[PDB]
Amino acid sequence: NPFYPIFYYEDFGAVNQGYSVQIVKNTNSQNEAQIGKRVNDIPDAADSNNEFTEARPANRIPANSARNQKAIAIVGTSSNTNYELEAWVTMPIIDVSKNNQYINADDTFKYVSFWTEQRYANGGISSLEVFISTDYTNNVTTANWTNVTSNVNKIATSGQNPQTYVESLLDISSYTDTNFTLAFKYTSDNSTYSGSNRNGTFYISDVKYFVSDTTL
Fold first, then answer.
1. CA 82 to CA 73: how far, in whole Å?
2. Has domain 6-212 been given CATH number 2.60.120.200?
3. Residue 196 contacts residue 133 (beta carbons within 8 Å)
4. Potential cystine with 211: which of 77, 107, 142, 164 (Cβ 3.0-4.6 Å)?
5. Are 204 and 156 contacting, i.e. CB atoms less than 8 angstroms apart?
6. What one-character DSSP code corresponds to residue 83?
7. Is 113 helix (H, G, I), strand (E, B) or coil?
8. How far apart are CA 156 and CA 166, in angstroms?
9. Contacts of 48 (CB under 8 A, 6+ apart)
């Protein structure tokens, strides 16, 4: 792999470049321009508790074209109103087997790292969950999903680490599927807004698929 240890790392730099969005529920008609929009607020030292330190690769991987990194934002609260949403942000369908030209049989361990943030989320009425499908093609409602939220030690969480990007690390070493789809599911409700009861805005950024010779 010329890009070793990274085999997939897009920039979300244009509409649907490395991601896609499906809005399965929008009961209270939040504007769609606020659901899965691209924003300039990406992790840096000052907004990650100085944990996002390394420089990004100059190019998108594997497209090998100039990187222009953007985050994906989902706004569950606007105008002091809680909007009930089910919004999915799906990653590309990636071959995580050794048939991938960038993955070799001696790459014993495989990981995805990603960064998430919540702003103005309080009370536990919104959440960001992570799922894996190995039969997804183009519709989240026609695929089978396995909830793997419990398999990351940290993810953006209502009431916790406000306005701070936090890193998740997901071990996918046991997967060898040719059509491997990671996805994020945002859910929120429409209970009465207050500073202690609000859906907030969640961010998804810097989803990096990579291998390792030793456990992480």
1. 16
2. yes
3. no
4. 107
5. no
6. P
7. strand
8. 7
9. 115, 164, 165, 166, 167
